[PDB]
């Protein structure tokens, strides 16, 4: 396959980070994660794992021939800037940066507090 | 504290029709600024809030696009 | 509605009966009733095929319409809602604009003085019948046909309903009342709504007669049986049978569905109990 | 709530003269009309407990005014009872 324009999806939780490259229509081309990179347990949350995942995803996308991507980011901030910088250094260029974090409108009920 | 433009007798009426008037009182995130920043009185602030949220319901303003 | 009996005799304490607030008449059309005789639980050979079933009350049968293809694109008005013993749910009488009279199962929420459209492009008012191809996804239906022109053969007892999921190719996926998922050819027809009279569960009988009149006879337990008549029988006193529980023909519990059935290699998943 | 037209006609019909508004007769007439209307409201609306509190306050006021009328005079009290069709 070949696609000139694509989209990049990044989410970073408190203990994991997964990144996938998708077509503008929503279909996915390739994805990478810390687990695939080879980190287990609490080591998965470090920004270095996010950098490796982003680099692997960017390389796999360039293999299919993606030139420009748009980054959609979400979740609590763990490796946001590091992942973006790694994607930049991987050889790709980003058009726009959009932050779309799910914000409930006082629905459901959060789990009780921790002690 | 800046001055309430609506206590004047020359102030324009408030309703869910004036798209620009309603837009000037909402942040570009699509939310409503606080009375502290706005500088209007309580009655006018509530009227503006009700009007903007009614317009949002009747689909003239985005839900925080 | 549900009516509860005030206790005045030992056998009547706690009994209940459904308050018929939905009935209008007690006289079926003479032109639509057909006779019926008590079969008695036997068969052509004279043996008992199923034990402890028999006796009862001389019932008359009402002819029901389960095709709804002969009349199409002609409206009808609901006339009356009537009692029907042969089946749990109530039935309704329809007057077609062309003049013919017909019976159908009474859907939930219907009432007198209403317009039912049976067209292939009819509206979504409950009670309409139309092929699945034209029905939007997500709606609730009942009286589904297994194959085109086969008659309504599913979801007919009271309180039941089937939910229609999306569509793909020439098949539609239907939630069975018991959690299964089954595919069916879209050419077949169905009806929108749910069957009425959902208050059957709460009925409490309280008196052996109210069962005998409906025609259920005593059960007799296994452990009391003699050893010759029943595998569990025998023993001095009372015992659990001294062997794993088993049907009284020797075959134990477990698998019952014949494998390699023509639907075995096409249907999706089985029931699950008490998840 | 009662409006100008019905209030005015009640005052005109029940007042001692054409200018009194605070007369006990007018007070009782207005109170009983209000109670009738609002009881009709609560006939359809069941769980308006604040309106029930309103009922209690109005009934207490009416009873107390009738007690004062009885204390001041008896013939007027009896005439008011028979004209309004109440019991006490």
């Amino acid at each position: 396959k070949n696609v000139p324009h694509g989209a990049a999806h990044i989410k970073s939780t408190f203990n994991n980070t997964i990144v996938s490259i998708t077509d503008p229509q929503g279909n996915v081309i390739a994805w990478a994660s810390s687990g695939h990179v080879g980190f287990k347990g609490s080591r998965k949350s470090t920004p270095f794992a996010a950098q490796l995942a982003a680099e692997n995803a960017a390389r796999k996308a360039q293999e299919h021939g993606v030139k420009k991507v748009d980054v959609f980011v979400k979740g609590p901030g763990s490796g946001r800037e590091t992942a973006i910088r790694s994607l930049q250094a991987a050889g790709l260029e980003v058009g726009t940066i959009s932050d779309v974090t799910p914000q409930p409108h006082n629905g459901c009920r959060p789990p009780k507090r921790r002690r | 504290t800046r001055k309430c433009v609506f206590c004047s007798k020359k102030g324009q009426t408030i309703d869910y029709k004036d798209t620009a008037l309603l837009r000037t009182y909402i942040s570009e995130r699509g939310k409503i600024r606080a009375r502290r920043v706005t500088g209007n009185c309580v009655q006018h602030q509530r009227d503006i809030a009700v009007a903007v949220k009614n317009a949002r319901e009747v689909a003239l303003l985005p839900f925080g696009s | 509605g549900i009516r509860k009996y005030k206790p005045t005799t030992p056998g009547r304490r706690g009994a209940s009966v459904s308050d018929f607030a939905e009935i209008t008449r007690s006289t079926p059309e003479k032109s639509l009733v057909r006779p019926l005789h008590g079969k008695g639980g036997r068969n052509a050979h004279g043996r008992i095929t199923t034990r402890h079933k028999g006796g009862g009350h001389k019932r008359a049968y009402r002819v029901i319409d389960f095709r709804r293809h002969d009349k199409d694109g002609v409206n009808a008005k609901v006339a009356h809602i009537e009692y029907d013993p042969n089946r749990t749910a109530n039935i309704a009488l329809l007057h077609y604009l062309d003049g013919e009279k017909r019976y159908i199962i009474a859907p939930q929420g219907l009432k007198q003085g209403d317009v039912i459209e049976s067209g292939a492009n009819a509206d979504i008012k409950p009670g309409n019948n139309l092929p699945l191809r034209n029905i939007p996804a997500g709606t609730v239906i009942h009286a589904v046909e297994l194959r085109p022109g086969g008659g309504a053969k599913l979801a007919r007892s009271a309180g039941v309903s089937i939910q229609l999921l999306g569509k793909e190719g020439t098949y539609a996926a239907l939630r069975m009342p018991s959690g299964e998922i089954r595919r069916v050819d879209v050419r077949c027809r169905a009806t929108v709504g749910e069957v009425g009279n959902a208050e059957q569960s709460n009925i409490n009988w309280g008196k052996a007669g109210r069962m005998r009149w409906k025609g259920k006879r005593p059960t007799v337990r296994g452990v009391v049986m003699n050893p010759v008549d029943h595998p569990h029988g025998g023993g001095e006193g009372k015992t659990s049978g001294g062997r794993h529980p088993v049907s009284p023909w020797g075959k134990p519990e477990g698998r019952t569905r014949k494998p390699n059935k023509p639907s075995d290699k096409l249907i999706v998943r089985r029931r699950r109990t008490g998840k | 709530a009662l409006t100008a037209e019905q209030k005015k006609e009640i005052l005109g019909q029940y007042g001692l003269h054409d200018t009194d508004t605070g007369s006990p007769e007018a007070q009782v007439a207005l109170l009983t009309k209000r109670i009738q209307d609002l009881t009709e409201h609560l006939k359809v609306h069941k769980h308006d407990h604040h309106s029930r509190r309103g009922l209690l306050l109005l009934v207490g006021r009416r009873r107390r005014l009738l007690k004062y009328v009885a204390q001041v005079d008896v013939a007027r009290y009896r005439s008011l009872i028979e004209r309004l069709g109440l019991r006490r």
Binding site: - | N54, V58, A59, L60, L61, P62, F63, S65 | - | -
Partner: protein, 96 residues
Amino acid sequence: MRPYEIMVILDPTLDERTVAPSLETFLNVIRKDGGTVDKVDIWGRRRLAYEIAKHAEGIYAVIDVKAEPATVSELDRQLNLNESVLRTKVLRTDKH
């Protein structure tokens, strides 16, 4: 006998010229019942903020009516029962 204001959104597939007779035949019921007065203004063909009923454009019409609560509720139910309407809002122009 109170003042009301009604706004109705119509799907873009309809023609601009054909809407006005539809509104007239809709409001004839009010006109014949309570001896009401009304004024009709139309201005539409504007993009919507968010997708509605798989539509992106629409027609905005504002109506002023002086009728009874029962009559306005009748109008509202009749309109909402239609399939060519998207949304309807009714409110009092007075203090309350």
